[PDB]
Paper text:
Ferritin is the main iron storage protein in most living organisms, playing a key role in iron homeostasis and detoxification. Canonical ferritin is composed of 24 subunits, which self-assemble into a quasi-spherical nanocage with an outer diameter of ~12 nm and an interior diameter of ~8 nm. Ferritin has prominent octahedral 4-3-2 symmetry, and each ferritin molecule contains 24 C3–C4 interfaces, 12 C2 interfaces, 8 C3 interfaces, and 6 C4 interfaces, which provide several potential pathways for metal ions and small organic molecules to diffuse into its inner cavity. Thereafter, we introduced a self-assembling strategy by designing π–π stacking interactions at the shared protein interfaces involved in two different kinds of 3D protein nanocage superlattices, which is referred to as key protein interface redesign (KPIR).
Numbering used by the authors:
A (entry chain H), B (entry chain H), C (entry chain J), D (entry chain J), E (entry chain C), F (entry chain C), ...: 3 to 169
Write the structure that this text describes.
Amino acid sequence: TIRQNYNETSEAGVNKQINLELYASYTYLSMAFYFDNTTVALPGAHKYFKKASDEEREHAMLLMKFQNQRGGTIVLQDIKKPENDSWGSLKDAVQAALALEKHVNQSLLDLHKLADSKGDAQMCDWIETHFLTEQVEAIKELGDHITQLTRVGFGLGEYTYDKENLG
Amino acid sequence: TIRQNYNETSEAGVNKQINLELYASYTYLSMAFYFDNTTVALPGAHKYFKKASDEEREHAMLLMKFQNQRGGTIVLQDIKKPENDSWGSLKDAVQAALALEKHVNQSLLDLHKLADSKGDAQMCDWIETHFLTEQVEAIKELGDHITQLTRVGFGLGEYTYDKENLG
Amino acid sequence: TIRQNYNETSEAGVNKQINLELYASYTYLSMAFYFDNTTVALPGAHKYFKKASDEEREHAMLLMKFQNQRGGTIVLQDIKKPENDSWGSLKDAVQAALALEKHVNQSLLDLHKLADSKGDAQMCDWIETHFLTEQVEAIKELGDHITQLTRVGFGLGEYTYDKENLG
Amino acid sequence: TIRQNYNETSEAGVNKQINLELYASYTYLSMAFYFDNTTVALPGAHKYFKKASDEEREHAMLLMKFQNQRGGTIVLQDIKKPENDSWGSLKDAVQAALALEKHVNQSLLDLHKLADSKGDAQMCDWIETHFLTEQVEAIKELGDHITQLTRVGFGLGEYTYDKENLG
Amino acid sequence: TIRQNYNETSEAGVNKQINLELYASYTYLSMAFYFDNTTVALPGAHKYFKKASDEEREHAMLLMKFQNQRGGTIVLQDIKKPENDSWGSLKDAVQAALALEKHVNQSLLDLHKLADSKGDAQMCDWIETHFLTEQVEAIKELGDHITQLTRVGFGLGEYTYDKENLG
Amino acid sequence: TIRQNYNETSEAGVNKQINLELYASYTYLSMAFYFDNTTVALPGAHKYFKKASDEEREHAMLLMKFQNQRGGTIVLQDIKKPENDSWGSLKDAVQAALALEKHVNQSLLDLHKLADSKGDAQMCDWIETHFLTEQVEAIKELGDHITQLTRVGFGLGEYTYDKENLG
Amino acid sequence: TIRQNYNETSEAGVNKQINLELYASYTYLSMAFYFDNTTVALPGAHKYFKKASDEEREHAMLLMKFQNQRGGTIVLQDIKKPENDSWGSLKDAVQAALALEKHVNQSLLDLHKLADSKGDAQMCDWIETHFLTEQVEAIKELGDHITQLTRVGFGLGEYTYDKENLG
């Protein structure tokens, strides 16, 4: 019996967060191959979102590794399909991604407000060390990608930011 | 308009196969972290299934890349959760995996019997080149893993095949 | 006598395909040196289409190598001049190449449907291995090039996609 | 005078934790040289527990380094002898270490709950950074070791997990 | 149970094809050491056919690997002795090898025609990938050998082609 | 809009803390060039404080980066001149630096106490990771410098500690 | 307008020479793969004519590059098929080659005599630099090839000069 100072409501939030980080992985993967369809054809975005889809997958496994470390149990659920089939312009996908990370961001803090509420000190710093700080930077990198894609404008500017920056 | 000699029923089978190869990726990922829970604690199996979950993910992207190459359109659906939460013994997971690959195997041939039926010659050899031959070997490697795990027996034999072979 | 299971009508479709792949190599060479004339002045397209003219010449030699391998005999015909002397904008030349590849694609499939009808199993896999999949990638890349040249537009965009992508 | 926001009760819990980490380093050293006696003869456990005794001695020096850093003063007490002279089978020693780590874990958390109560923000993150997560991994690995030593059994299995894993 | 979509009649043709490729490794072996007899003394042909005898042995093992991979059961029969104890001149042996490869070629296509009739798609491409194309090249090279051995003539030319080309 | 869980009062404390770390980079700069004046002539202290002046400048940029990362808005005020034009002896400067670091230390904890009161979890660990622990080490090293500068005494010892330790 | 001192008859004489070299490259290609057919099977001649086929293609692109450098316009006509389908013996192909190079030679001197009548001083030296001297060396090499092939005679001699010289 290795479980020590691990509430069962903190355990259910880890399962909820795992399914969430997998949902992001499955939306980015839609974005990535949306930019691969011949009617879009933005290769840099295809690479950029394909790494991002692989990185949100990393999030879920980390939370699955943590769940096993503390003594809980991984309870998986369905990964719902993304909320669109086409993602519009390059700006429109990045705007969609920002609101996704902001959703995951709030869910992570609520998970941290829950751990601090059950006095789960190790879970708090495990949330700080791996997620809280990484999430702000991703939002900031996204928020800086939107402002740039607005600047360059449609067309040649939309292509140039795909090759040079995301590629 | 790049679409040439690509039936729309061959297109729906690619979508069905993509969701399938993602279902396998999400079952292996359950197996992988099932073997990571402290009540199981078989590290070699955790690595072995974590690569396998990453490899079935490769299957889906390949079929998503193909879908975009021929001119179709990727229509994603929910990835259903695996059919168990605990996977029993190391033999029991490998037996479960074999019946999974055999399920994907039959679905791939049916997809190839469909393409040959619509005279889709390039899709047939794209199924031959990447999936048909790779699927038999995985089944054979699994069928050879079961027979070995039956030989070594429970306990020390179950651990030894985890470290030496899968690890 | 090396000829075995090589129908005589399968042998005529090979010579037809040889004269076809030489017509494409000779069309791209017109495109390549059209983009070299001082009134066009797009070097990346000149390089891009000069390698493609060499590559379709590779297609024909492969088909001539095969004809001799199966015991047939090569029968050359005239290489008709291209359908145009000037090829318009950079988008217009890529749209003509796409229209040309899709014709060669249909004739290869027709040649493959001809091989399977005569039970020429070895000829079928030879067309699978060297052309059918290579030809789908050729169409997908072209259709992606057109999508981008449409995005960047005329003027600076036509020069931009000429230097960075095609060259 | 360097002492700032360092409560005097936070200072006593540090000395208590120092004497605690020295008691663990001295218990593992008993275990390490128990597994070196000719009647046990398990070298991989001897090496494994001799590095752990050095590592808990590292814990205490970290806590002594911290005490001096915050302006406190180190007050040493006696290092009580371990609760046993012999430690039974290989599984029995790993189960005692687990029972020992979980005690040290509770005292670290108690020490952390003591730091947060006195608004000692820097002491809280110092306990987060060096111990809390390192201590969850120590418990998870031990509980995984017990699961395996149970699987392999006695006799050959107790020797096997001693040579390949612990050594 | 790994067997899936592997007809029992397709399994018989593999056992048959194994005994055939073994018959070809034993004929080339006879040819390889006929040219080593002091009354013949063509070392280049002794090297050439010995590699051929080792390569048709490879064929039998590839088919035996496939038989095990598809879940079947390898059934061996007698390897009949070659049809000649002496093989005449260098042209006469290469002409004999050409008639041998063409017999194996017809039995492979009949095996492939048997695989295609039972809908065994994987077996078909497996025969395509490893045999149908390799066999036509082996025949084409033997027919060219016969054409070149007829050009140089008997005597000196029969020695020259042995040293320079076969060796 | 990237701002999330970033109270407006927490934003004011960052602007304040930026102006503070700028005040510390401008005081150490005064100290660094006081020790360069010919009537002082302590080069090791001129090197030591110049690195300190560059390092507190780093602090201000880290806080300005964080202000932009969290979506806030950097507001700059005057950087007030230091409290002295001459800094006395080497002990007197290190004693002055210790009182400076302790002022910054208290304002950081008050900033952290402000971040904790608004539930700003990310800001708290961001202050933990980059400041709270770095600040206690800076203070501990200054107090040890004062203790060592008191041991060696004025004159020769005041020169020895400058060359060997600070330089 | 870059055109300067470039007559319009010299321009039509460059377009005629382009179609001539292209007819020469398409004849050598017929010769090369004629020597690849199994009833001929002369590998050294296949390689030799494939380089000469590729070499005469280079003549055509040099002239097209020249046509573009002088301000003109490339006008392409049909490349007529070679005058034979089978080329006889290796002596017979080199004799036909020599006659073809002598024809291109006179057409180049006629084009140099056409440029010298229009006072086109740069077109003269451009023909001298790239063609006139290369062509005489090509004619001297073919006539040298014809004298040797007659020396070695038919049969074994025709093979040896194929392997050793043309290979």
